[PDB]
Write an enzyme that holds these catalytic residues in place. Structure first.
Site, PDB file in Angstrom:
ATOM      1  N   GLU A 103      18.602  -1.686  -1.957  1.00 16.34           N
ATOM      2  CA  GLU A 103      18.998  -0.986  -0.739  1.00 16.34           C
ATOM      3  C   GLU A 103      17.854  -0.275  -0.023  1.00 16.34           C
ATOM      4  O   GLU A 103      17.964   0.011   1.145  1.00 16.34           O
ATOM      5  CB  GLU A 103      20.068   0.072  -1.057  1.00 16.34           C
ATOM      6  CG  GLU A 103      21.422  -0.480  -1.451  1.00 16.34           C
ATOM      7  CD  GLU A 103      21.585  -0.766  -2.936  1.00 16.34           C
ATOM      8  OE1 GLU A 103      20.598  -0.716  -3.703  1.00 16.34           O
ATOM      9  OE2 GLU A 103      22.722  -1.066  -3.331  1.00 16.34           O
TER      10      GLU A 103
ATOM     11  N   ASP B 169      -1.085  -2.822  -6.572  1.00 16.60           N
ATOM     12  CA  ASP B 169      -0.258  -3.391  -7.635  1.00 16.60           C
ATOM     13  C   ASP B 169       0.931  -2.482  -8.068  1.00 16.60           C
ATOM     14  O   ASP B 169       2.024  -2.962  -8.369  1.00 16.60           O
ATOM     15  CB  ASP B 169      -1.106  -3.769  -8.824  1.00 16.60           C
ATOM     16  CG  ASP B 169      -1.827  -2.597  -9.403  1.00 16.60           C
ATOM     17  OD1 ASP B 169      -2.644  -1.937  -8.670  1.00 16.60           O
ATOM     18  OD2 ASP B 169      -1.600  -2.262 -10.580  1.00 16.60           O
TER      19      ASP B 169
ATOM     20  N   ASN C  15      -5.530  -3.407  -9.437  1.00 20.53           N
ATOM     21  CA  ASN C  15      -6.473  -2.825 -10.388  1.00 20.53           C
ATOM     22  C   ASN C  15      -5.777  -2.321 -11.640  1.00 20.53           C
ATOM     23  O   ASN C  15      -6.304  -1.448 -12.328  1.00 20.53           O
ATOM     24  CB  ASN C  15      -7.316  -1.712  -9.729  1.00 20.53           C
ATOM     25  CG  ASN C  15      -6.597  -0.382  -9.629  1.00 20.53           C
ATOM     26  OD1 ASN C  15      -5.384  -0.314  -9.375  1.00 20.53           O
ATOM     27  ND2 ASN C  15      -7.351   0.689  -9.817  1.00 20.53           N
TER      28      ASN C  15
ATOM     29  N   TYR D  33     -12.298   0.676  -7.694  1.00 21.75           N
ATOM     30  CA  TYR D  33     -12.559   1.752  -6.731  1.00 21.75           C
ATOM     31  C   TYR D  33     -13.812   2.593  -7.035  1.00 21.75           C
ATOM     32  O   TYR D  33     -14.490   3.044  -6.105  1.00 21.75           O
ATOM     33  CB  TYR D  33     -11.335   2.699  -6.625  1.00 21.75           C
ATOM     34  CG  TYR D  33     -10.081   2.024  -6.131  1.00 21.75           C
ATOM     35  CD1 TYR D  33      -9.998   1.565  -4.834  1.00 21.75           C
ATOM     36  CD2 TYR D  33      -8.986   1.840  -6.968  1.00 21.75           C
ATOM     37  CE1 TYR D  33      -8.852   0.930  -4.369  1.00 21.75           C
ATOM     38  CE2 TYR D  33      -7.834   1.206  -6.519  1.00 21.75           C
ATOM     39  CZ  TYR D  33      -7.771   0.750  -5.212  1.00 21.75           C
ATOM     40  OH  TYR D  33      -6.637   0.113  -4.744  1.00 21.75           O
TER      41      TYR D  33
HETATM   42  C1  LIG Z   1       8.410   6.515  -4.742  1.00 21.15           C
HETATM   43  C2  LIG Z   1       7.032   6.938  -5.156  1.00 21.15           C
HETATM   44  N1  LIG Z   1       6.720   7.303  -6.459  1.00 21.15           N
HETATM   45  C3  LIG Z   1       5.435   7.710  -6.775  1.00 21.15           C
HETATM   46  C4  LIG Z   1       4.435   7.758  -5.797  1.00 21.15           C
HETATM   47  C5  LIG Z   1       2.986   8.184  -6.112  1.00 21.15           C
HETATM   48  N2  LIG Z   1       2.311   7.036  -5.640  1.00 21.15           N
HETATM   49  C6  LIG Z   1       1.961   6.879  -4.319  1.00 21.15           C
HETATM   50  S1  LIG Z   1       1.356   5.443  -3.983  1.00 21.15           S
HETATM   51  C7  LIG Z   1       1.472   5.007  -5.557  1.00 21.15           C
HETATM   52  C8  LIG Z   1       0.993   3.638  -5.928  1.00 21.15           C
HETATM   53  C9  LIG Z   1      -0.449   3.729  -6.407  1.00 21.15           C
HETATM   54  O1  LIG Z   1      -0.893   2.526  -6.980  1.00 21.15           O
HETATM   55  P1  LIG Z   1      -1.129   1.195  -6.119  1.00 21.15           P
HETATM   56  O2  LIG Z   1       0.076   0.848  -5.213  1.00 21.15           O
HETATM   57  O3  LIG Z   1      -1.469   0.079  -7.026  1.00 21.15           O
HETATM   58  O4  LIG Z   1      -2.353   1.556  -5.161  1.00 21.15           O
HETATM   59  P2  LIG Z   1      -3.750   2.156  -5.671  1.00 21.15           P
HETATM   60  O5  LIG Z   1      -3.765   3.628  -5.585  1.00 21.15           O
HETATM   61  O6  LIG Z   1      -4.061   1.567  -7.005  1.00 21.15           O
HETATM   62  O7  LIG Z   1      -4.673   1.679  -4.612  1.00 21.15           O
HETATM   63  C10 LIG Z   1       2.050   5.941  -6.386  1.00 21.15           C
HETATM   64  C11 LIG Z   1       2.321   5.775  -7.843  1.00 21.15           C
HETATM   65  C12 LIG Z   1       4.791   7.347  -4.505  1.00 21.15           C
HETATM   66  N3  LIG Z   1       3.926   7.340  -3.509  1.00 21.15           N
HETATM   67  N4  LIG Z   1       6.066   6.954  -4.180  1.00 21.15           N
HETATM   68 MG   LIG Z   2      -3.534  -0.057  -8.141  1.00 16.47          MG
END
Ligand SMILES: Cc1ncc(C[n+]2csc(CCOP(=O)(O)OP(=O)(O)O)c2C)c(N)n1
Ligand SMILES: [Mg+2]
Ligand SMILES: Cc1ncc(C[n+]2csc(CCOP(=O)(O)OP(=O)(O)O)c2C)c(N)n1
Ligand SMILES: Cc1ncc(C[n+]2csc(CCOP(=O)(O)OP(=O)(O)O)c2C)c(N)n1
Ligand SMILES: [Mg+2]
Ligand SMILES: [Mg+2]
Lengths: 559, 559, 557
Positions: free
Chosen positions: C46, C448, C475, C546
């Protein structure tokens, strides 16, 4: 034959004989004659209705009922609802609502979102939607009202639905009104009770601190028998006065945080300093006997007994927490302590001499009477007027009320009545009404101050109309006196615009409402006026000028 | 130098010179002398405080302020807050709370969840958490209160935090108090205003139905000049009486749903039957001039003008909705209708003759006076005592109030004041306090019934203390008369226990409060009492016995 | 002929052609074929529904609709609704409820107090009670949704009433063409006090937020900036109010930019500025006063169709409460005679950004995100007509690269969630963007962690055959969260942020979406170009790292 009929009918099934209130335009949907055995008691303000219901519920131990119209009717009732939720009474509070298809809160005339407003101050809050369901809504409301901590349940009644017969057929299922409140019980409460027993065995100077929940549970005689056998002193909240009779050697008095300051005496330390174990029997923080008030002198161990889980562990962390019914605890505890030798009880004779001397104060003063002289005079005439174990003294809210806590005679449970939890000024009249109706053949005295009394004085007319022989004493100093005390505590001076009134002639005020009244300025006059009032067979009001003579010194227990 | 100082100081920054209320134990944190130029106005009940602020804010067009203690203080105040939210005034409502570390709603002594209770009946509701932020909270409150629909904004103030200097360093930023309410404006309202102009062109008998929002916008002179130029009749809500002067040919009076029934006349039909276009200028459903009241006779087209999106499309689907500032709509409308020919206005002389017939009623009745004769007398003495374009007649709530709507003289905007949205009984005294303070040199008369007046009568002492020369007329039929009417509409009979009082001597009651008074029982005595009252330089109260003799059948328009 | 018909019908009256959601047992009361011209768009979860509606509504400027069943349906939807309320979109959120006579929240099977739960995150929340009123509930919902700050309106629908014809036997819709806003009295006067500050100022700037786009004020703002030579800085989604290359396009702000560039970028952008005009200001977009308060104290002017909700944080010297366009038009008139200004120099910052984007190195492990986005920009410039195309970014560390470096050649050319910032946002935002721009290219970049939080709607992309091209930068970590561990604690803790391996190529292919792997610039450019011309959805997974520097992100406090 309408949802109005079903409503009153189901209230009758739960034992309700009266609905207190002020009726509004919903009168088109409900007359209040629909059901034999249930009368409407009209008040001058909805607050009076809610409190009278609250107090009648406290004394009878049975659900009671109050009533208001939509919008401001409901918000005016809400201070009575708040009285019930904080002081703990099973009150069914009913208020009308705009027509169901026309409910637009804050847009439709007189339309507020009643349920959103009342839900945070109630056990249960709901809006009628299908007329025939009112029966189940009353039952769910009684159910929640009669579960500890007991409190008010609210039903909002859209005017069209209240007057509709849709879905209603003329076979009522049994009510099963609880005869005493439903409570919470932890697994292994007996084990915790045994641990409390083990503390009692080690303790040299224990006390029972009794709250009103012990009275609701039906535990008074059992507590008394326990206390007497083991020579354990009993200390009370404001409304648990009377769990032991006046003059009983184990009756160590009630606690208020104002007592050191009022008596100019180290009262709290005398009561608690040598104590090594405090059993808070039926404890409830809302009654305002707080841990800080018994934390005096030596370290103490504590035992909490309450039919609720402890809501305030930031403030009260008992060494032993016993979550169970109070009577059930006392019965289990008697068995566990049957072998124990009686204790040597600590000496509070200096505090008793101090109290007796305040009450016996033979001086005549320049300005007015002192409140302790007034209460002592009230005690004398109450004892004359009332059968033994009978009578009610009621106190409105103010600095004088704490004199009531220390000085007023209580010879039965709820023999001294005030609002410990909510403490709304003007509480006195509706409480005296509820009390006199609960105890029809008993003297009912009320003491109130000028500030609080006048906040709700208009229901003097209700006292006359119902012909309730309440004797009222207004102690007048043309001030919100308690608040001038707090000005001085915080800033070491007064500011009259926030606390000072001009003159009100409460004698003339009473007479305009059709209540006979008189002025009294010393013991002799006060005694005569009380004795006249008690024997009058009609309500009577006595105005007494007073002064307080305070010294903002001894009031640190209020922090 | 404390948050108490910073609060009062920021209220002074937004123009506030008064705070009405009752002060509780928070007096330990706030004296109300911390800031030159803001005085405390103590009442006997918090409802009085909130309603005085609401009225003073309505007349001044500037934010005003009220005050209560925690728990029951806050709930009492809430009937005032509800007055403000339904009648639309910018009120800053302030209440103490338990110490921040001790806030456990329904457990801590006097602790209610104030924000949860007040939020449903306010524009904004918040609890203070860090002292120095009290400045930005006051601003955010003012911000939300002065956005349409204007209303109350609430701040709960834990006593520790109010009295703390933590984080507070004395240079205050500029206030930017809106000079008139911020409203909403739809894109393309100019286009919708032109569609309304095209409908006016093509229409034989248009009317302007004017609500209080039009006065708030400053649109009265402009509305007057449009009506005069194009010969458009002006009909008003209760409180927009006086947008034209008395006698003006286009002053087609006020609407109330009770009017056919009071007058025994097809008044709604006479007023609207031949009308083909209704322009509801400053429309607000809360004022209780509902569509069904102008839906008489021929199919009409409607134009809504308000600075709010339409909240009630279930009930009002205007042909043209013009969401904008009223004054800006009228200026644009003048432009687009500058060359239009004036209209032939419809004839309502049968209704005028009927209203004039009630006002002139010279019969002496066996029982008491009739309310129309009571109001006629008040009109005569108000016209005598007041300069032209000046004076205020205030009305409490009850059956008599709608006689007020039909008959009472109003020679300026808000010249007739009553609560149209919330309609709490007891309104009169505080509305008259507010009206008198906003117009210190104009006469201020109050009419109230016995039910409503006694509901809040204790604040007569406040009138004496402040020495406000309000002339009060109490119309007494020992009944909640409006309610007895609704009993008869719904059931075709009365039930006395829900509506009937015993005797109250309001003369003696007033005098007990320090207000001189007298009983008047006919026109000659009333005129004499009103003349004395208006010249006394002191408040005065007049008791008049009345009766109604109502006709339950003619009130169909109430559904 | 039922309330369900009346509801759908009234949604069609308001321009709605799609309802996105997941349907529960309320299917017995509503089929979704009752009204020609309104289709149902089934998702896998949803949240995807709600977010797709939010993005379709932002791009179209028109109310959109999402749908959920009772209880957990409604709570799942609520993250969508939270997205709409914080990011600002006019969405009508619809959820079923238990039969009216059986509503006992937390006792009846699947019954939750929906209105109480959604009221705090919505413009309007109500439960249906009498079937024929659904028409006016839909209208009141659209009314509150299309008033600034625009947002979602919620109607709870008991199943019995939804499927009932009682009282059901239409008036004009009047859907606002653009949002209703507030307007203070004296705003013309406050806008003149602003023009007086612009006259007495040497280096002014325009900080533009998406509310200027909703007002239709983009052409007008361009003209005022060109004539007076004022630089235009934006929030994350106002990127593209000026075209790529335009000399006054000073890019977008994000508190992560100093730290990512290893360069005093905010200092460069704002140090010598002396007047900041926040045009369509909204604190929810996360461009906070602290980010422009570099160097000398600046004067500030706020322009929003709302009263200042946050006076604790932003106390402008001048507050102009009115419609944005109308403000611009009145400001032009007051500044007509003004001479152009000297705009301060930010070439050092432009050069550092360009240098990132051109980075020719080949890293042992995998690519860097700045290189990934550069390759994305290149292929998007090729695939898309001028003034066209949409790069969508999910949430995470890489998203702040997207803010700095991603190409936007129109309003909403760069899409991300600025307000709510729920991970998994990307798929549904790309679904909505692609549907709003059916003939434009639509690229999505997601990390990811976030991609996998909501990866199951790859099957919805396949099913609807929306030719979105997705790059998952992997990553094996919630990377952004690892950064915050290092800022706070000066080390990592892997159990709170590390994953094992996920093969997003195989994950895509399992959903019927063609995919491939890419590990350098050249492999990435071939994948993107293949994908843009595939006429089918396509996914590319790129390994990244990174090597971030914790100490450079002091701006996040
Ligand atoms: C619903 C929700 N839970 C937790 C978070 C904290 N958070 C924000 S973006 C994210 C993802 C981070 O990992 P990724 O998408 O792989 O991007 P990266 O930082 O590795 O570039 C998380 C866990 C969030 N933004 N939204
Ligand atoms: Mg990541
Ligand atoms: C509803 C409400 N508002 C404010 C208060 C604060 N307050 C408590 S008792 C009281 C009355 C004090 O005056 P009075 O009744 O004369 O008693 P006194 O202290 O003078 O003895 C007041 C104003 C309150 N208790 N209840
Ligand atoms: C707070 C509140 N409770 C109940 C009502 C219902 N009600 C409205 S006016 C009123 C008073 C009616 O009696 P009175 O003031 O004497 O006027 P009358 O109708 O007798 O002319 C009542 C009880 C109300 N309006 N407001
Ligand atoms: Mg006093
Ligand atoms: Mg009356």
């Amino acid at each position: 034959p309408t949802a109005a009929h079903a409503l009153l009918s189901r209230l009758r099934d739960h034992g309700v004989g009266k609905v207190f209130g002020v009726v509004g335009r919903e009168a088109a949907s409900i007359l209040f004659d629909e059901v034999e055995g249930i009368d409407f008691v009209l008040t001058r303000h909805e607050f009076t209705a809610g409190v009278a219901a609250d107090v009648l519920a406290r004394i009878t131990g049975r659900p009671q009922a109050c009533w208001a119209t939509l919008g401001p009717g409901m918000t005016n009732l809400s201070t009575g609802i708040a009285t019930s939720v904080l002081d703990r009474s099973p009150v069914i509070a009913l208020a009308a609502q705009s027509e169901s298809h026309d409910i637009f809160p804050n847009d439709t005339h007189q339309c507020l979102d009643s349920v959103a407003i009342v839900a945070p101050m109630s056990k249960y809050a709901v809006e009628l939607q299908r007329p025939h369901e009112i029966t189940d809504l009353v039952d769910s409301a009684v159910n929640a009202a009669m579960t500890e901590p007991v409190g008010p349940s609210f039903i909002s009644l859209p005017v069209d639905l209240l007057g509709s017969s849709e879905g209603i057929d003329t076979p009522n299922p049994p009510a099963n009104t609880p005869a005493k409140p439903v409570g919470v019980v932890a697994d292994g409460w007996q084990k915790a009770a045994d641990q409390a027993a083990a503390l009692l065995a080690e303790a040299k100077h224990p006390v029972l601190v009794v709250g009103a929940a012990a009275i609701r549970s039906g535990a008074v005689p059992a507590i008394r028998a326990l206390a007497e056998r083991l020579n354990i002193p009993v200390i009370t909240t404001y409304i648990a006065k009377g769990v032991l009779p006046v003059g009983h050697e184990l009756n160590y008095g009630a606690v208020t945080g104002y007592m050191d300051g009022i008596l100019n005496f180290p009262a709290l330390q005398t009561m608690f300093a040598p104590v090594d174990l405090v059993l808070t029997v039926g404890y409830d923080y809302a009654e305002d006997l707080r841990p800080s008030m018994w934390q005096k002198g030596i370290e103490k161990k504590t035992v909490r007994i309450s039919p609720t889980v402890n809501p305030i562990p930031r403030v009260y962390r008992p060494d032993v927490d016993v979550v169970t019914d109070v009577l059930a605890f006392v019965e289990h505890f008697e068995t566990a302590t049957a072998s124990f030798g009686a204790k040597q009880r600590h000496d509070i004779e200096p505090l008793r001499a101090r109290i007796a001397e305040f009450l016996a104060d033979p001086e005549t003063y320049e300005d007015g009477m002192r409140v302790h002289q007034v209460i002592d005079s009230m005690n004398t005439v109450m004892e004359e007027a009332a059968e033994p174990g009978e009578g009610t003294i009621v106190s409105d809210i103010g600095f004088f009320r704490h004199y009531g806590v220390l000085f007023a005679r209580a010879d039965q449970p709820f023999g001294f009545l005030t609002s410990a939890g909510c403490s709304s000024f003007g509480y006195g009249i509706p409480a005296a009404i509820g009390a006199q109706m609960a105890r029809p053949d008993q003297p009912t005295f009320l003491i109130a101050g000028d500030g609080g009394f006048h906040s709700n004085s208009s229901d003097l007319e209700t006292i006359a109309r119902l012909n309730l022989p309440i004797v009222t004493v207004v102690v007048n100093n043309d001030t919100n006196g308690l608040i001038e005390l707090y000005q001085n505590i915080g800033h070491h001076r007064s500011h009259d615009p926030a606390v000072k009134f001009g003159g009100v002639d409460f004698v003339a005020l009473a007479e305009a409402n059709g209540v006979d009244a008189t002025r009294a300025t010393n013991r002799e006059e006060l005694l005569a006026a009380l004795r006249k009032g008690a024997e009058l067979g009609r309500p009577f009001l006595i105005e007494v000028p007073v002064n307080y003579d305070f010294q903002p010194g001894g009031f640190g227990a209020l922090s």
